[PDB]
Design a binder for these strands. Structure first.
Length: 53
RNA sequence: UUGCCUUUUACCAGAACCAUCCGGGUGUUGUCUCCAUAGAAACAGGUAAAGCUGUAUUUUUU
C-alpha cells in the first residue's frame, strides 16, 4: 500500500506537470510563438493521448 | 515581450535592470624636458612715472 501510494502520488504530480506543459505548448502553437518542430509533434501526440483518455 | 524562424549559436527590435569598453576632465603630488639664478626693500620728504578726485551774495567753508 504505502510504496504504491507514493508512486501513484508522484505519477499524479508528473501528469499535472505534463498536462499543464502540453496545454502551454498548445497555446504557444496557437499564437505562433517559436515552437520547435519536434516540440509541436510531441504536443500533437500528447494532446491526442489526453483527448483519448 | 517581439521578428526571421523552427535546433543552437550567430541574429531582428523594443523594454527594464545591469556591466564592459573607446575616451574626458578637474585637483594634488611625483617625475621627464626646455629656459633661468635674487635674501631683503618702505620712513623726513624730493626727482620721474603710473592709479582715482578737484575746478565768497539764503542749506554747510566766508
Amino acid at each position: 500500500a504505502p510504496i504504491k501510494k507514493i508512486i501513484e502520488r508522484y505519477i499524479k504530480s508528473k501528469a499535472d506537470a505534463w498536462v499543464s506543459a502540453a496545454h502551454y505548448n498548445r497555446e504557444r502553437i496557437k499564437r505562433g510563438a517559436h515552437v520547435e518542430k519536434t516540440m509541436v509533434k510531441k504536443n500533437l501526440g500528447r494532446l491526442t493521448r489526453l483527448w483519448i483518455k
